[PDB]
Amino acid sequence: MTFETRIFDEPELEFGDHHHHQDPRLGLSEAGPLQTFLGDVIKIGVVGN
Amino acid sequence: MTFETRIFDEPELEFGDHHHHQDPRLGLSEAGPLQTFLGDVIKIGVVGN
Numbered sequence: 001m002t003f004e005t006r007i008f009d010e011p012e013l014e015f016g017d018h019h020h021h022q023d024p025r026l027g028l029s030e031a032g033p034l035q036t037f038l039g040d041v042i043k044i045g046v047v048g049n
Numbered sequence: 050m051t052f053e054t055r056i057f058d059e060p061e062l063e064f065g066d067h068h069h070h071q072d073p074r075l076g077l078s079e080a081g082p083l084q085t086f087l088g089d090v091i092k093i094g095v096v097g098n
Contacts, residue, residue: 039090 012020019031061069062076065083070076 039088041088
């Protein structure tokens with residue numbers, strides 16, 4: 001048969017502090033964001049009733 | 050005599066946490082700004098040779 005089948009693996013995603021994992025959820029919960037935020041405050045404004 | 054002369058006092062500027070003074074240098078050093086920055090970070094970029 002002239003059919004060539006490939007099964008690629010799940011690609012990795014590089015998180016912060018040189019840690020890589022295939023799941024964004026567990027990867028963020030383990031090592032945090034790639035580019036850290038200098039500070040600790042994110043201010044939110046709400047518009048509605 | 051024939052003219053009404055008034056010498057006004059030095060006006061008071063309101064600084065943070067209910068403090069007032071006339072000199073902006075001394076008022077800012079001992080009381081701080083009126084609206085405190087919710088955070089601890091100010092990022093400065095430089096452009097030049």
